[PDB]
Ligand binder design. Structure first.
Ligand SMILES: Cc1ccccc1[C@@H]1NC(=O)c2cc(NC3COC3)cc(NC(=O)c3csc4ccccc34)c21
Ligand SMILES: Cc1cc([C@@H](C)Nc2ccccc2C(=O)O)c2oc(N3CCC(C)(C)CC3)c(C)c(=O)c2c1
Ligand SMILES: Cc1nc(NC(=O)N2CCC[C@H]2C(N)=O)sc1-c1csc(C(C)(C)C)n1
Lengths: 239, 1017
């Protein structure tokens, strides 16, 4: 029980470096703070709670009746539905050395760039896959129209072919057949083009997943390298 | 699906000048016709049937009139081109082919659906195929709001329809700030009424002197009196001519489409009040009511064709803990360079309701779990806004990492609780997300079915479970002295101030008294445990019987901290009553983004906004564009698309005007796409040569002439002054566009409408900034503090696409310094800015011009500092010829910004402005003109500090939008440092003076550097 020892006592650091010091933790991981004074950080119910301690009359306490007269002997009572505190957050955890962690920040940048390059070709592939999916549906609707055109040909041309036959004008039916062949030949060109696009779709969807695989492999490293570029305070300008 | 690009063909941006189109004739013959790129369908169909006569079975061809063209769009839909004016290039074809068919079915319904589909950006046919019953229910049910609004539109048959199209642009209150009343002459203002004598437009003046609080009908009466005075009439006849002709006329702002329809005082109208403060003479045009109503179409509202003993228990009954089975996942893309697990958690909005349970770690290549998860929570203790957040994760305990996530509403929109087996397609984790769960992310299943699909089973009970109605909630809910000092102190605390467990329990205990302080409700709601039906039910009864509060305070209850529908419904009910249409237009940017949080498609908020949009076209206009600009985003696509469909089906004839805007933007997007891509490595000359040549084409001239500006649809865009249009220097290839103002009396207002179309940069940041700047100006003005800001128009229309209003007669400080004034060539020095201002304002104009600069500078100086947009340079600060300062291009600054520097910020342009504020003066460090400037800033800085809660809530609501500078509340916390909310009111001013003094002295010493903005010091 000392003014400052460095066991669970930081300064009055912000609420940004508090929630992040007990995010995804058990019913504990606490630290001391100040308020607009004393403040204690708690965790119960899956939530992040915050308690104030009035230090008036040179004494301390949570509830209405003042029941203490020191800082570090207020924790011991509730330590062992006012639920208990479990594990504290230390001030000693990972010789004039800010230069070795220059290699972890070099790695962080070298992992950010390579991930950004992969995320670039992930979005670019993702967009192009969605483009090709719609293009197939357009080809499908195109073929349906061209096949509905063939029905219109066979429907109307029957009475005229069943008349040029009864007349011997052969190189007049040829004109009708030469066009119907052109229509059917175009349908095969559309279907053959749509089949090639289906090849490009599944060959890219495979490459799309290979990008996702390498991203999911690299992502864990970037998140843990965030902790290893930590900075010490009150020291100005570092590379 | 929505087409990806704005090109004419699939893959090709621009059709070659001559295209070979394979036309499918109605006799069954295919002929290939070489069509011109800009040819209309009328000409194409005509020349087709002439060429068709060469081919067999041409005797079967009927008249060209009896046929219509059909083809496949880039959206992959079958569009029947009923409007045959449309050009080949403007058809949005997938591949160049046309089919000649005979029309079947209802022609009117076919047209309306394509009109609505074009306005949205996706065909309506896709919504019809969505089987999700919530979607189809919303579509069917939301038409109630549409019909309600249309009935109010057609309530006062002719007049109410004019009020809809031309709503009175007025301030919220008629009260005039102290300094504005002093500008007018002893309670009255000089006003000029104009009249068009003949169709060969010439004009007659009627200069009047009228009380500022006169209504438009009284203004017309005074104009009639002046004319009838000069004629032979008795006192009774002069009296009768006014009475019988007061209500036969109508007033309108000369040079734009803003009408004085409602009986508000003339000073409350923004145009007149602006004229009063600026000292300009208002010019109004006299019009006949019979002339305005003649232009109103009288559009109808017709319903579409998509408006066509089970055991049940209550949730207040079932006794068990929450139990969820994690059956199996289809596939997970992993390298076999790492076992995987499924992390879950029950959340109430952002806050978790209980502990987060995990599944067993299973092999990387075999994704199956099949384990009942047991959550640490009671089922009846669930609130209405309870929802499950889960995700698939991996491990190197050594290194955890998520891959695919997905959230579900534990309750349906029917109030039913999930029961049984469910397949959920997962979403990919965003670029900048390291959290194992994504709780605040979008709720629901991923429409894209080709992603990892995690299946799960819910606990099946005997009957069907439903959340209890409010009457059952009141039953469970059924079961002093002076601590008022703290309640009124924490009620006035900013929403980002911490609420301790002492204060949370202290608020919950003294909650029954808190009703007397209704502004403490946001604090009280945070002081509640939402995993206890006991407390939730007691808050429910309090909320319903809670006094109405200011709409600014109610807007806070719609952000990401208040997901409970009873809390939101209260806020909507407060807005329905108290919020003015003026403030609605003001805060529409936040209110639209707030819609994203709401759990379900149908709710009170959408029904409120949609009705107001269908009741006021100025609200509806921006309501449309704010929704459409987010249609690129898949996460919002469905809801916003369904909501845009609701508006487009009911808005009326303005749907055609919106389509003309869309088509105009589509042209600009594609034109810029060519300059940014394809013609990337070409010089300015060649691209300008392409621009002039391409804009001159008839398809472009017709599309981008004669439509309403999306920045302000009151401004009409006539013919293009192509001699002014140009591509700007920026690498993002922006388009400068000039338009003639087709107003009959453009002479007396906007002679040229200039807009910057930029394709590439995200303009969402500028919109919010320019909005807050506008709000800051409003607060100062209402407190009798004249600080003239310039929140120029800006509107985002899509993914990094939008428009920027051009300020006339304005130049950057850099541009000011380029002139020189024949003092060498380009050589300048600080004094030049002042010399330029004096050289362009001579005489007594000078004194008022210097005043305008100081007032405008003080406003921006304060504003920029509070927001952190202060470190600006010559390129980003502009001065008008009259001498109004205003900062520009706020997004550029935000793109160019770890957390350890900024302790010293040198403003080099302090010296340049001090010379402007105080003429010459070698030692201008302390003058009487400067002492005035400082006091103006002090009054302003404290004025924004008083209204700090508003700005915090404004930013907090803008967290739904995916901005990189607005993700957590830690980003918004910065305002608390600048405003110094924790520090004393007097100490905050002492803090401000110190911050400014340091920036001033820092500017003197530093060496700026002109081009690269690198300080040598
Ligand atoms: C979020 C916010 C709200 C209110 C004030 C500040 C912030 C930001 N948080 C900060 O920590 C920070 C720091 C700076 N500059 C550094 C100072 O030394 C350099 C500026 C800004 N400004 C904005 O980001 C901002 C201004 S209007 C607008 C519209 C939309 C998106 C963002 C913005 C903030
Ligand atoms: C004449 C002038 C003076 C200043 C400052 C340096 N001076 C004062 C201002 C108010 C009251 C007193 C003083 C004083 O020092 O006496 C200006 O500051 C800014 N910024 C905002 C504040 C930042 C720290 C972010 C720097 C950028 C801008 C944009 C100006 O236009 C400006 C203009
Ligand atoms: C509001 C606004 N107004 C402008 N006015 C002008 O440019 N001019 C006025 C007549 C002479 C001409 C000139 N100075 O060359 S630019 C701008 C503005 C605001 S954000 C912006 C970026 C495009 C740089 C992002 N631009």
């Amino acid at each position: 029980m000392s003014l400052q020892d460095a066991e669970w006592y930081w300064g009055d650091i912000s609420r940004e470096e508090v929630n992040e010091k007990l995010r995804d933790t058990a019913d504990g991981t606490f630290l001391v703070r100040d308020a607009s004074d004393y403040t204690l950080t708690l965790r119960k119910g899956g939530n992040n709670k915050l308690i104030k301690i009035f230090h008036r009359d040179g004494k301390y306490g949570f509830s209405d009746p003042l029941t203490f007269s020191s800082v570090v002997e207020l924790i011991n009572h509730y330590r062992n539905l006012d639920v208990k505190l479990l594990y504290p957050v230390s001030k000693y955890q990972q010789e004039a050395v800010g230069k070795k962690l220059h290699e972890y920040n070099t790695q962080f940048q070298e992992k950010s760039r390579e991930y950004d390059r992969l995320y670039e070709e992930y979005t670019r592939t993702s967009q192009e896959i969605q483009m090709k999916r719609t293009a197939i549906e357009a080809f499908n609707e195109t073929i349906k129209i061209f096949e509905e055109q063939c029905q219109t040909q066979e429907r109307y041309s029957k009475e005229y072919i069943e008349k040029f036959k009864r007349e011997g004008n052969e190189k007049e039916i040829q004109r009708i057949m030469h066009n119907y062949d052109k229509l059917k030949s175009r349908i095969s060109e559309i279907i053959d083009s749509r089949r090639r696009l289906e090849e490009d779709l599944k060959k890219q969807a495979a490459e799309y997943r290979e990008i996702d695989k390498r991203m999911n492999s690299i992502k864990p490293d970037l998140i843990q390298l965030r902790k290893t570029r930590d900075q010490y305070l009150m020291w100005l300008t570092q590379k | 699906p929505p087409r990806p690009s704005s090109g004419e063909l699939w893959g090709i941006h621009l059709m070659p000048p001559r295209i070979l189109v394979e036309c499918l004739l109605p006799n069954g013959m295919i002929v290939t016709l070489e069509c011109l790129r800009e040819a209309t369908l009328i000409t194409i169909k005509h020349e087709l049937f002439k060429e068709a006569r060469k081919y067999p079975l041409h005797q079967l061809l009927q008249d060209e009139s009896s046929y219509i063209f059909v083809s496949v769009t880039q959206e992959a839909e079958r569009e029947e081109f009923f409007d045959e004016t449309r050009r080949l290039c403007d058809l949005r074809l997938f591949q160049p082919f046309l089919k000649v068919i005979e029309p079947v079915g209802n022609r009117e319904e076919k047209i309306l659906n394509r009109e609505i589909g074009f306005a949205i950006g996706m065909p309506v046919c896709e919504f019809d195929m969505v089987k999700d019953p919530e979607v189809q229910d919303f579509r069917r049910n939301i038409l109630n709001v549409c019909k309600e609004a249309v009935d109010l539109r057609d309530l006062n048959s002719p007049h109410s329809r004019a009020m809809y199209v031309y709503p009175p642009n007025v301030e919220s209150s008629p009260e005039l700030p102290k300094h504005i009343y002093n500008k007018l002459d002893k309670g009255q203002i000089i006003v000029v009424i104009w009249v068009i004598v003949s169709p060969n437009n010439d004009k007659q003046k009627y200069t009047l002197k009228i009380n500022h609080d006169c209504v438009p009908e009284q203004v017309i009466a005074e104009a009639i009196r002046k004319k009838t005075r000069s004629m032979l009439l008795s006192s009774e006849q002069l009296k009768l001519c006014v009475l019988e002709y007061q209500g036969k006329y109508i007033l309108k702002v000369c040079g734009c489409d803003e009408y004085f329809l409602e009986k508000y005082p003339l000073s409350q109208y923004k145009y007149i009040r602006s004229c009063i403060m600026l000292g300009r003479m208002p010019n109004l045009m006299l019009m006949a009511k019979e002339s305005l109503y003649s232009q109103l179409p009288m559009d109808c509202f017709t319903m579409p064709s998509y408006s066509r003993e089970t055991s049940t228990k209550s949730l207040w009954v079932i006794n068990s803990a929450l139990r969820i089975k994690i059956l199996c996942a289809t596939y997970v893309n992993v390298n076999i360079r790492d076992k995987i697990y499924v992390r879950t958690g029950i959340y109430h909005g952002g806050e978790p309701l209980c502990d987060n349970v995990n599944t067993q770690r299973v092999p990387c290549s075999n994704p199956r779990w099949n384990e009942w998860l047991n959550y640490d929570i009671y089922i009846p203790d669930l609130p209405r806004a309870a929802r499950l957040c889960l995700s698939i994760c991996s491990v190197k305990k050594e290194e955890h990492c998520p891959l695919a996530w997905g959230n579900i509403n534990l309750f349906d929109y029917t109030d039913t609780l999930v029961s049984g087996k469910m397949a959920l397609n997962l979403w990919p984790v965003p670029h900048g997300l390291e959290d194992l769960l994504n709780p605040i992310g979008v709720t629901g299943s991923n429409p894209n079915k080709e992603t990892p699909c995690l299946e799960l089973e819910f606990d099946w009970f005997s009957s069907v479970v439903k959340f209890p109605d409010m009457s059952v909630i009141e039953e469970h809910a059924n079961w002093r002295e002076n601590d008022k000092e703290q309640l009124k102190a924490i009620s006035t605390r900013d929403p980002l101030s911490e609420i301790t467990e002492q204060e949370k329990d202290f608020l919950w205990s003294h909650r029954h008294y808190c009703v007397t302080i209704p502004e403490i409700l946001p604090k009280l709601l945070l002081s509640v445990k939402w995993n206890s039906r006991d407390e939730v039910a007691q808050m429910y009864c309090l909320v319903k019987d809670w006094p109405p509060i200011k709409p600014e305070q109610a807007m806070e209850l719609l952000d990401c901290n208040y997901p409970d529908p009873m809390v939101r419904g209260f806020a909507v009910r407060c807005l329905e009553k108290y919020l003015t249409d003026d403030k609605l237009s003001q805060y529409l940017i936040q209110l639209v983004q707030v819609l994203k949080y709401e759990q379900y498609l149908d709710n009170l908020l959408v029904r409120f906004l949609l009705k107001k949009a269908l009741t006021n076209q100025r609200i509806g206009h921006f309501f449309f564009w704010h929704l459409k600009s987010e249609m690129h985003n898949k996460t919002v696509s469905q809801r916003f698309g369904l909501l845009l469909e609701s508006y487009c089906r009911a808005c009326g004839m303005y749907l055609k005007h919106l389509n003309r805007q869309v088509e105009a933007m589509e042209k600009l997007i594609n034109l810029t796409d060519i300059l940014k891509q394809e013609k990337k490595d070409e010089t300015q000359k060649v691209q300008m040569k392409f621009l002039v040549e391409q804009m001159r084409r008839p398809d472009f001239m017709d599309a981008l002439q004669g439509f309403l500006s999306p920045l302000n649809p009151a401004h009409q865009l006539g013919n293009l002054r192509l001699e002014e249009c140009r591509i700007m220097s920026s690498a993002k290839r922006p388009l400068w566009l000039n338009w003639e103002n087709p107003d009959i009396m453009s002479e007396l207002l906007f002679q040229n409408n200039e807009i910057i179309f930029k394709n590439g940069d995200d303009l969402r940041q500028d919109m919010l900034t320019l909005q807050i700047i506008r709000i800051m100006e409003n607060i100062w003005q209402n407190q009798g503090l004249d600080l003239r800001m310039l929140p120029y128009g800006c509107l985002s229309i899509g993914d990094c696409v939008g428009l920027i209003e051009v300020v006339r007669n304005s130049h950057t400080i850099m541009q000011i310094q380029c002139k020189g004034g024949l003092k060498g060539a380009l050589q300048f020095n600080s004094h030049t800015l002042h010399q330029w201002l004096k050289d362009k304002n001579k005489g007594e104009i000078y004194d008022a011009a210097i005043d305008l600069f100081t007032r405008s500078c003080a406003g921006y100086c304060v504003a920029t500092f509070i927001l952190g947009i202060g470190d600006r340079h010559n390129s980003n600060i502009m001065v008008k010829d009259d001498g109004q300062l205003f900062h520009i291009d706020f997004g550029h600054f935000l793109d160019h910004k770890f957390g350890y520097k900024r302790e010293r910020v040198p403003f080099v342009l302090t010296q340049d402005f001090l010379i402007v504020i105080s003429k010459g003066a070698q030692e201008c460090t302390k003058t009487r003109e400067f002492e005035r400037f400082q006091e103006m800033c002090y009054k302003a800085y404290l004025a924004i500090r008083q209204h700090a809660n508003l700005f915090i809530n404004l930013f907090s609501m803008m967290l739904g939008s995916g901005m990189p500078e607005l993700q957590s509340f830690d980003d918004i916390a910065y305002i608390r440092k600048t405003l110094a909310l924790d520090k004393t009111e007097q100490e905050a001013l002492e803090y401000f003076m110190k911050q400014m003094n340091d920036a001033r002295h820092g500017g003197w010493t530093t060496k700026m550097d002109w081009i690269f903005h690198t300080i040598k010091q």
